Amino acid sequence: SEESQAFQRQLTALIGYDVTDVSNVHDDELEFTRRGLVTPRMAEVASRDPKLYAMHPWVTSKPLPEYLWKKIANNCIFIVIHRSTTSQTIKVSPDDTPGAILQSFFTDFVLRVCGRDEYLVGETPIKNFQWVRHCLKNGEEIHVVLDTPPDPALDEVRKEETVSLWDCDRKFRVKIRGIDIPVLLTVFVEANIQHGQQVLCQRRTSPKPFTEEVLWNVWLEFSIKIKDLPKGALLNLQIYCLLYYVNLLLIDHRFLLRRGEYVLHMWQISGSFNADKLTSATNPDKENSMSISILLDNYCHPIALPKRAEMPNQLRKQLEAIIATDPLNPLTAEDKELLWHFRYESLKHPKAYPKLFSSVKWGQQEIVAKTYQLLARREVWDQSALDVGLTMQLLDCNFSDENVRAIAVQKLESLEDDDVLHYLLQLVQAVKFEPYHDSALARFLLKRGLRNKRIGHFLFWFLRSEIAQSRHYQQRFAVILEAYLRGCGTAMLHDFTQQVQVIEMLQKVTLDIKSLSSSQVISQLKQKLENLQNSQLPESFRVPYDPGLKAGALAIEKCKVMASKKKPLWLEFKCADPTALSNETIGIIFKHGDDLRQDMLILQILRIMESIWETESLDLCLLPYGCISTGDKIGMIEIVKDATTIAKIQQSTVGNTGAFKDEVLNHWLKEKSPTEEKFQAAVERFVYSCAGYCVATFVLGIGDRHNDNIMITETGNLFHIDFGHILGNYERVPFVLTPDFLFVMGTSGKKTSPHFQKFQDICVKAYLALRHHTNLLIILFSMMLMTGMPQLTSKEDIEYIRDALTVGKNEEDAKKYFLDQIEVCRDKGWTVQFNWFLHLVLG
Ligand SMILES: CNc1nc(C)c2cc(-c3cccc(CO)c3)c(=O)n(C3CCCC3)c2n1
C-alpha cells in the first residue's frame, strides 16, 4: 500500500529517529527484531478488551491504607455527580462497584472525572480507584460528570499484511587489521571476551606510535574454545595509550558464531562503568570518529550454537550467611565454589539465585549445561511471592544469559498494572543491559505498553527521551517505540501527535529566548507565544507528566522568562476541559541545561519510597512532582502551585544577606494560613513532610542540599527539587533540618518540644521501613547510577547506599545511627547553609 508508506513517515517523526535507516548498522539484528516484535504486538492488540482499553481505568488491588480509613466518616464516601449543571451528591459504600453508583441513580453511560481524562469504569470497588484514593489523601471532593463512553472504534489499528559449535575445539581467535583516526603516544588494542561483566579471556597487541593510521595484521588467539563461547558473549575491542571502545556479540541473534570482516566505528570516552559501555551499537559519526578493523577467521563456517547428597553444619551455616548478605557484598572464590557445589541446596532459596547464578563459569560449556539443568528445577523460584528487588538483580549488568534473565521477566508478568507504573522507568532503563535487541523484557514492556493506555503513554515518553539523547541506545529503543506505535491505536497515535507538535515548538521557543541572554527580552517571549497560539499549536494536548490532564490555550499574560543563569520559560496553560471543577491553570517549566534524566530517576525512586511506606501505613507526604526529559539537557517540569523556595522566604525578611533568621518560616506559615487552626495542619504537614525528605534524601545521598533547592507550600508541604545539580555535577551535614524547620516544630536550641519528638518517631519508623527493603533500594539505586549518572559511578559511589541503609546493623543499632544523624543537624545549625551561600552565591 501507500497508506503504509506515508504512515512510516509520521511514526518516524513521532519517534524522532528513522529506524528503517541503515547507515549505522553492520548486520540485520534490528530489522530482525522489528520483524520479531510484529507477533507480540498483534498478539496483545488482538487480546485486549477494546472497552476497558478505551477508558483505561486506573485500578489498584492493594489494601486501602490506614490513614485513608481513619479519614472516612463511616463506610460512607461521597461523590458529587454532574450533568447539565444540575449537580447532586450521593452516599456510597467504599465497596460500591462503579456501575452500581448508577443502578443507584436511576432507582448506556459511564462516570467520568471532572477535569480529567479519567473514568471510573469496570468491575472494581471505588475504594480501589487511584483518583478516589487521591481525593481522600489530600481531602477534596469526588466530582464526576455522568457522560458518554468513548468509542473503541477509535482505537482500531491500521491494517497489517551446518556444523554445530560444540563440535569445534580450536581456541577462538580474531585478527586485528588495525585502527585509523582521521584527526589527532603509544597505542595498543585490547580484545576482551566478556559475559555479563565477567571477563573470560583477554589479549592485546604490541604497542605502536600513535599515528593517523595503525595496522598490526596480527592474530590474537584466545584461551576460549569455540564451543565454550556462551550465547551473549561480547568481543570487546578497546584502545589505550583508555580512549575508545566498541563491542560485537560473538554469537548472533540467529545463534551463529560471527565470522567475517568488520569495520566498527568506535565510542570516545569523556572526562569505571556505565551502561553505554556495554552497547552492541556503533558510533554513527564517522567523519570524526576513531574506527577499528578486524577479521574473524572464516572458512565455511555455519556455526551453530544449539539450544543432592547432604550437608555438614558449618557449611550450611557458611551458606546461609552468603545467601544473607546484600546485593553489593562481593563473592569470594571460596564463596562461589561453595554456592556451586551446594547449588541444589541453593536453589531452594530464591534469595540465593543472584549469588548462585553469578558463581557460574559461563566460559565453560559443561557448566552452563548444568546450570541449565538447574533452571529446569525452578519450582521454588516459580512458587514464591513476587519479590521485585530480587527480580531486579537478575536483570542488571551482571547477568548476560537470557535464560536467567527470562525467569526474572517471568516473575514480572504477574505485577498488577499499578506496579508496572512504579518500576516502568527503571525496567525501560533495564533494556540497556540486555545483550540482544529482542528480549523477554523488551517484549514485556511492549505487552504491558499495549494493554494499558497509562503505561503506554509513559512508555512512549520514557523511550522517546532515551532515543533523543543516547546514540548508544536509540536504535534499539526506536525499534521498541515503533512496535508500540503500530498497535496503540490511531486514537492515542493521534494524541501522541498533538503532544509532540506542541512540546517541540515550546522547546525551540525556549532555546531561542535563552539565546537572547531583561526588559528587552520579556517582550519576545510574549510575542512568539502568540505566533504559536495562532494556527499551528493545536487546540489542546495531554500534559505529558500527567496523562489525565489536557492543556488548552496558553496564557501569555502569565508566562515569562526567569532569573536563572539559563533562561527557563514559566509557561501557564488553561485546562482544555470545561467539566473542570476549578479554574487554576496548568503550570509547566521548560528548561535547557538541566539533565532532567536524573530528576526523573530520583523522582521515581521517591514514589517507590512513598509506596514502601504505604505497606507499613505511614504517609510522609512527599511531592514527587511530574518531570519529563524530552532531549539532552532539555525537558519540562510540573509546577507545584502556591510554593516557594525556602531561601526566598529568607530573602523575604532578610534579603540577599544570608544572615539567616531562625524564625521567618514559622512566620511565613501563619501569614499564609487561613486561620490558626488549618495553620496547625500546615505545621503537621511539615513535620511528616520534612522527615520524609530527611530520610529519602539521606538514603540517596542527596540530603546535603542548598537552600534555594528546597521548597514549601503556603499549606505546609515541603519538598526538594533540582536533583539534577548535585549528583549531576558533583564540612557537611546528613540532610537538612535547619533552625527554621526545628523552630516550626516547636524546638529551639537545646530544648525538645513534642512535635519534634514526633518528627523523630517518624524519621525512625520511616528510616527502618526502607531498611526492610535494603535489597530493593540497593538495586534500584545501583541501576540508577549506571544508566543515569554519567561518569559518577566508580562503584565507590554505589556502595554509599549500603552505609546509609546501615546493612549489618540491628534495628536498635539503627534507630540510634539516624538520631545521631538528626543530631549532627542540631549541632551544625547554619554553618552549612551559610556555607553553601558563601559558595553558591559567590564562592
Ligand atoms: C512554584 N512551585 C514550583 N514547583 C516546582 C515543582 C518547581 C520545580 C523546579 C525545578 C527546577 C529544576 C529541576 C527540577 C526537577 O528536579 C525542578 C523549580 O525550579 N521551581 C521554582 C524555583 C525557582 C523558580 C521555579 C518550582 N516551583
Distance CA 98, CA 120 (A): 6
For residue 514, how far is its CA from the centre of ligand 1 (angstroms)?
A: 17
What residue owns the CA closest to ligand 1's atom 22? Answer: 645
Distance CA 560, CA 568 (A): 9
Distance CA 399, CA 198 (A): 9
Phi, psi of 102 (to 5 degrees): -140, -45
**Architecture, CATH, for domain 490-641:** 2-Layer Sandwich (3.30)
Q: For the chain, report the end-to-end CA distance as a whole number of angstroms.
A: 64
What residue owns the CA closest to ligand 1's atom 18? Answer: 721
List of E strands, 304-381: none
Q: Breaks in the chain, named by the residue before each, with C–N above 2.5 Å?
A: 107, 161, 184, 241, 271, 307, 517, 730
Distance CA 209, CA 506 (A): 50
Q: Beta 291-296 vs 541-543: how paired, if at all?
A: unpaired
* Residue in the structure block whose three cell numbers are 544449539: 306
Of 622, 645, 655, 759, which is closest to residue 712 (Cα–Cα)?
Answer: 645
The whole-angstrom distance between residue 125's C-alpha and the CA centroid of its chain comes to 30
Distance CA 30, CA 282 (A): 13
- Please say whether the beta carbons of 633 and 594 come within 8 A: yes
- Give the CA distances from residue 616 to residues 68, 528, 623, 758, 811, in Å, rounded to whole numbers and listed in that order: 13, 50, 19, 17, 16
The whole-angstrom distance between residue 713's C-alpha and the CA centroid of its chain comes to 27
What residue owns the CA closest to ligand 1's atom 27? Answer: 639
Domain ranges of the chain: 1-161, 167-301, 302-489, 490-641, 642-834
For the Cβ of 645 lying below 6 angstroms from any atom of ligand 1, the answer is yes
What residue owns the CA closest to ligand 1's atom 24? Answer: 562
Distance CA 132, CA 64 (A): 11
For the Cβ of 722 lying below 6 angstroms from any atom of ligand 1, the answer is yes
For the Cβ of 599 lying below 6 angstroms from any atom of ligand 1, the answer is yes
DSSP states along 806-840: TTTS-HHHHHHHHHHHHHHHHHHTTTTHHHHHHHH
**Fold topology of 642-834:** 1.10.1070
Q: Name the binding residues for ATP.
A: 587-596, 622-630, 719-727
**Architecture, CATH, for domain 1-161:** Roll (3.10)
Ligand 1 atom with minimal separation from the 623 CA: 6
Q: Name the binding residues.
A: 587-596, 622-630, 719-727
Superfamily of domain 167-301: C2 domain (2.60.40.150)
For residue 564, how far is its CA from the centre of ligand 1 (angstroms)?
A: 11
For residue 721, how far is its CA from the centre of ligand 1 (angstroms)?
A: 6
Q: Where are the alpha helices (DSSP H) in 619-753?
A: 646-653, 664-672, 677-700, 726-729, 739-745
What residue owns the CA closest to ligand 1's atom 26? Answer: 639
Phi, psi of 739 (to 5 degrees): -55, -25
Experimental method: X-ray
Q: In what order do the strands lie in the sheet with 77-82?
A: 91-92, 77-82, 142-147, 110-113
Distance CA 398, CA 396 (A): 5
The whole-angstrom distance between residue 601's C-alpha and the CA centroid of its chain comes to 5
Secondary structure class of 203 (helix, strand, coil): strand
Superfamily of domain 302-489: Phosphatidylinositol 3-kinase, accessory domain (PIK) (1.25.40.70)
Residues 6+ apart with CB under 8 A from 687: 745, 755, 758, 759, 762
- Written as one letter, the residue type at 78 is F
- Please say whether the beta carbons of 55 and 548 come within 8 A: no
For the Cβ of 651 lying below 6 angstroms from any atom of ligand 1, the answer is no
Of 782, 814, 812, 776, which is closest to residue 397 (Cα–Cα)?
Answer: 782
Return the ∠ at Cα 78 (arms to 75 and 79), rounded to 5°: 140
